[PDB]
Structure formats: C-alpha cells, structure tokens
Design a protein around this ligand. Structure first.
Ligand SMILES: OC[C@@H]1O[C@@H](O[C@@H]2[C@@H](O)[C@H](O[C@@H]3CO[C@H](O)[C@H](O)[C@H]3O)OC[C@H]2O)[C@H](O)[C@H]1O
Ligand SMILES: [Cl-]
Ligand SMILES: [Mg+2]
Length: 346
C-alpha cells in the first residue's frame, strides 16, 4: 500500500474519526493497516470535544484513538493543544461575556497541556501544539487566545508542551500557508518566536487544496521557505475539493444550492481523471522535496467520511480523498503508487 511505496520518502497518514478509531470496522482496520503508518485524531483531542464547558474531562474516544495506534504500531499525532475553534467560550469568558485575566487563562492552559500531553507522553510522537494563529488578513488571528495573552499564547503553549513531553515533535499547523502572503507572515512569526527560544520542531501545512488552486509552484515555495527555518515540513490535512467554490453574494454563499452540488449521482470519469492528475502533481512535488518532508496525512480515509461533504456548505457530495464511499481505491490512488513503482534510480 501507500505507506510501503513511500517508505523511503515520508510517512503516509490519515485522520481518524471516533467511529473508525473504535476498532469496530474490520474493513477499515484492514485498509488502514495496509495503507497508513501515521494517524491523527480528527476531533477527539480538541479542547471543546474532550472537555465539557465546566472543564470536566471524558477520555473515552481519545483513549480509544491512542489504543488503536498502539495496537497497529502507528505513528500518532496529537491534534491540537491550543486553537481558537472547537473550544468553549467558558475557557475565555465569564458568563457576562467579559474576558478573564491573562493569569487565569495561563493557568487553564497549563492545566490543559500538562494533563493532555502528559497522559499520552511517549505514546504520541508529535503534537500540533498551536493551530491557525495567523489570520487570513495576514495579521495575527484575532482570537480570544491572542486578545487576552498576545503572542505569549503561542510561546507558552510550545514551552509547556516541551516540558511535559520533551520527546514529542512539536508543530505549528495552518491552512493557506501554501500561498503568498500568509506564507511570509507565518515565516516572520515563527522566526521571531524561534529567536525568543521557543521549542518547535515541525511546520504543518494543512493542504486543503482545490482541484485547480493553489498551483504547485506556490506550494513549492512554502516547502522551501519553512524548511529554511530548520523545521521539518509535514502535510497534515490533505484533501482536494472538487466542488464549485464559494471562496471567490458573500452572506448567501454558504447556503445549499443544487447548482453548487453537481455530483450527487457520482463523480464522472473526466473529473476522476482531473482529481488523479491533481494528486499526482502534488505527490511529484512531495517526492522532489522528500528530504524536507516528514509526513503526508490525508484528512480522512474515504470520501464518505470527509468534512468537505459538510464544509463550507452543509450536505454536499464531495470526492476529496483516495478511497471512495465503498472503500475502493480511486484513480488518484493508483497514480500515487505508480510514481514510486516506476521511479528511476541507479
Ligand atoms: O459533521 C460532523 C463531523 O464534522 C467533521 O469533523 C470536522 C473536522 O474534520 C474539522 O477538522 C479541521 C479541518 O480543518 C483543519 O484541518 C483543522 O486543523 C481540523 O481540525 O474540524 C471541524 C469538524 O466538524 C467530521 O468529518 C464529521 O464527523
Ligand atoms: Cl470524530
Ligand atoms: Mg507506542
């Protein structure tokens, strides 16, 4: 499978939802063991999913994920310690809406990281310590984290994670950093935190790509720029959106319309071909820069369980991954295998 074909290049990973990570699906257990040598929990280690609004913890799904990776001897990436999404407003705010102090939030971060990264110390090889800190306007994202703590929210998150599990490979992770503008803003931020002595080992490019954009050349610039920071590059959340885009009026663009969901009956072969060529282009690039890249993780296993079916428009039928809704490999899968099977060396 993919993991074996790409053995000499990088890990091949998948994000697993809680149903998959339970181990109850024999067909996926088989598929995953064959294809992937790394996994990431799709949701269960996120603050607002793992904990309730009162801060109470429920380990069932997170433990099941770690048990699954241990059972199958898979490299495991924790996702994610500090992020502005899927986290209760109660972490940051009093019931009246007012923000708590920097000191009070720091205490909460310390408790969260110490507990979560501590539980799985030595079991998870890597952590997405901070996710999505640069805004799409290229300034620091105006989250509660940032408004209360400043850039110390990032510095302190990495410091704490490194104290709790000194052996973990600590990553900053973001989307659209394949693109000019955000790439450079991210480079500058990381540069300035590295200067301050922040422990950081890796840089995650999410890789939520469109069928057309961004071009390979922009992605290449990012691989090269982030590697120059002395960081290992990971592609963390790969998928290819094949459906009409709403990214380019502004307030109805997220509503369901049938014209924006044109493949409910199946993805036609011509689009299968385009999708296969797009993934092939991408993996050619990755192979080219295998010296800089530790991992390529897909944000799901099969198309039936992709988040892009419901984002950014609820209820669509998307086709973003390497396995179809019956778990059969798509044409894109075979193009990826052929890149390695037919590789030329001395
Ligand atoms: O519809 C219910 C549920 O939604 C899906 O999970 C979503 C995640 O996949 C999503 O992951 C983020 C994707 O963007 C970035 O890569 C980020 O780093 C990821 O955490 O987060 C929102 C979730 O709703 C599941 O597919 C499905 O069961
Ligand atoms: Cl899940
Ligand atoms: Mg282990």
């Amino acid at each position: 499978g993919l993991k074996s074909a790409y053995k000499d290049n990088f890990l091949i990973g998948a994000a697993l939802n809680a149903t998959i990570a339970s181990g109850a699906d024999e067909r996926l257990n088989t598929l995953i063991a064959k294809e992937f040598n790394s996994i990431t929990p799709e949701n269960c280690m996120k603050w607002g999913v793992l904990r309730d609004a009162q801060g109470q913890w429920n380990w069932k799904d997170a433990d099941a994920f770690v048990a699954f990776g241990t059972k199958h001897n898979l490299h495991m990436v924790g996702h994610t310690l500090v992020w502005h999404s899927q986290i209760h407003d109660e972490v940051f705010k009093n019931a009246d809406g007012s923000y708590i102090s920097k000191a009070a939030l720091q205490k909460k971060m310390e408790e969260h990281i110490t507990t979560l990264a501590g539980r799985y110390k030595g079991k998870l090889a890597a952590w997405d310590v901070v996710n999505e800190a640069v805004g799409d306007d290229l300034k620091m994202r105006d989250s509660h984290w940032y408004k209360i703590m400043g850039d110390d929210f990032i510095y302190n998150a990495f410091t704490l994670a490194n104290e709790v599990d000194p052996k973990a490979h600590l990553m900053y992770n973001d989307y659209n950093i394949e693109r000019t503008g955000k790439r450079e803003a991210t480079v500058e931020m990381i540069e300035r935190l590295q200067k301050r002595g922040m422990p950081i080992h890796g840089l995650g490019i999410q890789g939520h790509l469109g069928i057309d954009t961004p071009p390979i050349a922009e992605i290449e610039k990012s691989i090269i720029a982030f590697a120059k920071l002395g960081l290992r590059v990971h592609f963390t959340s790969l998928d290819v959106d094949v459906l009409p885009s709403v990214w380019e009026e502004v307030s109805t663009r997220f509503e369901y319309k049938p014209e924006r969901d044109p493949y409910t009956k199946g993805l036609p072969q011509e689009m299968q071909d385009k999708l296969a060529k797009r993934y092939e282009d991408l993996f050619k690039l990755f192979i080219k820069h295998s010296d800089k890249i530790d991992r390529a993780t897909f944000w799901g296993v099969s198309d039936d369980a992709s988040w892009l079916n419901g984002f950014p428009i609820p209820g669509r039928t998307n086709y973003p991954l390497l396995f179809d809704r019956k778990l059969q490999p798509k044409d894109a899968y075979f193009r990826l295998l052929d890149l390695k099977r037919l590789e030329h060396h001395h």
